[PDB]
Amino acid sequence: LSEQLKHCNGILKELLSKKHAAYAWPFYKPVDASALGLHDYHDIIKHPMDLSTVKRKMENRDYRDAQEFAADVRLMFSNCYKYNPPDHDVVAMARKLQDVFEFRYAKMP
Amino acid sequence: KLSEQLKHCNGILKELLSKKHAAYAWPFYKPVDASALGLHDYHDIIKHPMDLSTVKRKMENRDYRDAQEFAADVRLMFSNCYKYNPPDHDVVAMARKLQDVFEFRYAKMP
Amino acid sequence: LSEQLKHCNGILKELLSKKHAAYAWPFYKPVDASALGLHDYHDIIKHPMDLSTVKRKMENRDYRDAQEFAADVRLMFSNCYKYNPPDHDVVAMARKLQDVFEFRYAKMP
Amino acid sequence: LSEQLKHCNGILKELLSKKHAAYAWPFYKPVDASALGLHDYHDIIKHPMDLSTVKRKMENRDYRDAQEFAADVRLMFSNCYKYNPPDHDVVAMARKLQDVFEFRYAKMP
Numbered sequence: 530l531s532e533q534l535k536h537c538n539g540i541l542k543e544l545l546s547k548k549h550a551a552y553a554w555p556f557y558k559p560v561d562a563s564a565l566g567l568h569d570y571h572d573i574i575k576h577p578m579d580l581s582t583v584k585r586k587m588e589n590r591d592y593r594d595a596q597e598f599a600a601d602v603r604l605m606f607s608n609c610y611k612y613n614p615p616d617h618d619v620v621a622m623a624r625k626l627q628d629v630f631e632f633r634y635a636k637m638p
Numbered sequence: 639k640l641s642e643q644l645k646h647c648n649g650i651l652k653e654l655l656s657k658k659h660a661a662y663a664w665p666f667y668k669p670v671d672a673s674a675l676g677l678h679d680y681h682d683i684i685k686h687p688m689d690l691s692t693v694k695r696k697m698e699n700r701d702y703r704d705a706q707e708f709a710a711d712v713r714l715m716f717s718n719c720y721k722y723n724p725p726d727h728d729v730v731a732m733a734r735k736l737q738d739v740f741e742f743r744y745a746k747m748p
Numbered sequence: 749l750s751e752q753l754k755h756c757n758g759i760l761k762e763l764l765s766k767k768h769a770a771y772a773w774p775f776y777k778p779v780d781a782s783a784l785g786l787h788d789y790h791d792i793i794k795h796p797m798d799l800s801t802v803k804r805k806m807e808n809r810d811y812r813d814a815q816e817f818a819a820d821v822r823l824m825f826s827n828c829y830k831y832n833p834p835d836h837d838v839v840a841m842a843r844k845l846q847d848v849f850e851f852r853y854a855k856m857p
Numbered sequence: 858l859s860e861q862l863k864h865c866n867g868i869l870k871e872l873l874s875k876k877h878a879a880y881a882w883p884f885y886k887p888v889d890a891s892a893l894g895l896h897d898y899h900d901i902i903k904h905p906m907d908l909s910t911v912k913r914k915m916e917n918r919d920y921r922d923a924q925e926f927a928a929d930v931r932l933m934f935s936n937c938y939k940y941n942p943p944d945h946d947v948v949a950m951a952r953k954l955q956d957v958f959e960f961r962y963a964k965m966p
């Protein structure tokens with residue numbers, strides 16, 4: 530449904546909005562593993578995902594339905610939990626942004 | 639009878655049911671008692687109720703095809719809670735704390 | 749071959765280099781159809797491609813071989829030719845950058 | 858590259874190296890002011906600068922001498938000090954990276 534993907538577009542705009550910027554910013558663009566010297570990042574994370582990639586896929590009309598959109602957003606969070614120790618700042622930030630995502634996604638008509 | 643991935647999923651379920659998480663897991667142990675709570679619209683809004691006892695029985699019955707089906711049921715349980723409730727309800731805060739345990743352990747699956 | 753994709757990474761770095769910026773810049777990021785007022789862009793171009801997308805796919809190890817890399821770079825140029833009239837400045841820039849790409853790609857060991 | 862610009866290239870490689878990544882990463886690419894909701898960033902900062910811009914200029918042989926290189930690196934730090942309050946994490950990181958830069962630059966033959 531166009532209606533479902535319109536709601537998904539609204540969720541993405543919320544995740545990218547200034548009120549969430551203090552915990553969303555690590556997810557705005559791909560993790561720059563090369564720049565950070567994370568030589569194992571692409572060994573451990575086979576399918577990187579970030580909000581810019583989700584936005585481009587939405588603009589390109591690449592999502593068949595809301596479930597495909599949700600799978601990419603959850604992949605982004607799962608990658609973060611998979612790669613990082615539980616006490617890293619970025620894990621606390623992922624959890625805060627995921628709470629926003631899961632709540633808005635659950636309210637989809 | 640359980641695959642390596644579904645054995646890890648069984649370990650996650652045992653953790654979600656364990657005493658250390660009881661202070662925020664207990665609302666998810668059994669079905670939402672809509673009658674007792676006076677929730678006359680609960681089953682109008684939530685078409686597919688799910689709780690940890692349902693997931694446990696499906697695991698014991700070997701009803702899960704793979705880890706993704708397990709994760710879908712656990713996320714359905716949390717999504718039902720977010721769908722029905724306002725964001726400031728105590729049960730939503732509890733759902734978020736338990737979901738953080740689930741998502742972290744699920745992501746670390748060999 | 750790792751060797752082939754290493755050469756492809758060298759080609760991408762050349763396409764992104766300052767010496768080609770005068771004709772490469774329209775290809776650095778996805779076409780901003782909203783900003784340009786291009787209401788039909790995503791109706792006509794079903795599979796957008798740009799050098800930032802190619803770079804992310806390379807870093808993610810999404811390319812199986814040099815041929816898959818070349819197919820995405822040629823898709824980027826083909827989208828530009830498909831959407832635009834032959835006298836548009838962006839078509840002249842696409843041709844100049846494609847000459848750099850085709851020449852370097854042909855010289856691959 | 859001249860002898861002095863070869864030393865400047867060695868400084869750039871050090872600033873981009875893994876040992877400094879914990880405080881260098883905010884300077885790797887242009888500040889994404891739009892993504893962070895910093896609506897006034899380009900009103901306050903007239904000449905953005907970052908290590909990727911310096912690296913592209915160095916690769917293109919655009920620096921006339923070591924002083925032009927030093928001016929761009931100091932502009933990057935000055936932009937950070939100009940825009941930010943003194944207690945922001947990014948200001949502490951700028952100071953740590955600038956200490957590496959100033960020390961190595963001073964030792965240039």
Ligand SMILES: Cc1cc(F)cc(C)c1Oc1ccc(C(C)(C)O)cc1-c1cn(C)c(=O)c2cc(-c3cnc(-c4ccccc4)[nH]3)oc12
Pocket residue numbers: 555556558559560561562564565567608609612613618619882885
């Ligand atoms: C969010 C965050 C806070 C912080 F204080 C330091 C870092 C490095 C940090 O994470 C990032 C900062 C910048 C970027 C850019 C913009 C360069 O792409 C990415 C991250 C980052 C994002 N995500 C989603 C991660 O999962 C992740 C992991 C790491 C990381 C960096 N260093 C480690 C690390 C190093 C040694 C041992 C174990 C982990 N892990 O950095 C990020």
Ligand SMILES: Cc1cc(F)cc(C)c1Oc1ccc(C(C)(C)O)cc1-c1cn(C)c(=O)c2cc(-c3cnc(-c4ccccc4)[nH]3)oc12
Pocket residue numbers: 665666668669670671672674675677718719722723724727728729732
């Ligand atoms: C955890 C919790 C704390 C609290 F202070 C009040 C309630 C109702 C609460 O949640 C439950 C308490 C008991 C039970 C029993 C054991 C009787 O089944 C269930 C819940 C409960 C669990 N789940 C998973 C829910 O999604 C949910 C929703 C509600 C609920 C009750 N009232 C509301 C509500 C109030 C105002 C506006 C909208 C919804 N929502 O209660 C539960």
Ligand SMILES: Cc1cc(F)cc(C)c1Oc1ccc(C(C)(C)O)cc1-c1cn(C)c(=O)c2cc(-c3cnc(-c4ccccc4)[nH]3)oc12
Pocket residue numbers: 774775777778779780781783784786827828831832833836837838841
């Ligand atoms: C390069 C260039 C020169 C120019 F004079 C005018 C434009 C629009 C132009 O192209 C772009 C300028 C900016 C951007 C941004 C940065 C906003 O994303 C994109 C383009 C651009 C890139 N690509 C790859 C294109 O294929 C394309 C097509 C168009 C375009 C805009 N208007 C037309 C057009 C006009 C009349 C009839 C048919 C098409 N075509 O703009 C771009």
Ligand SMILES: Cc1cc(F)cc(C)c1Oc1ccc(C(C)(C)O)cc1-c1cn(C)c(=O)c2cc(-c3cnc(-c4ccccc4)[nH]3)oc12
Pocket residue numbers: 554557883884886887888889890892893895936937940941942945946947950
């Ligand atoms: C380094 C750092 C730590 C942190 F906890 C939060 C932020 C926002 C941060 O800075 C950045 C994080 C990500 C990025 C990306 C990769 C998105 O481009 C950039 C910065 C960042 C880099 N530089 C060089 C800055 O000067 C700057 C300033 C800010 C910033 C964000 N918010 C403020 C601010 C807040 C209140 C009053 C004034 C300024 N300043 O963020 C950056």
Ligand code: NA
Pocket residue numbers: none
């Ligand atoms: Na060919």
Ligand code: NA
Pocket residue numbers: 888889890891
């Ligand atoms: Na900006």
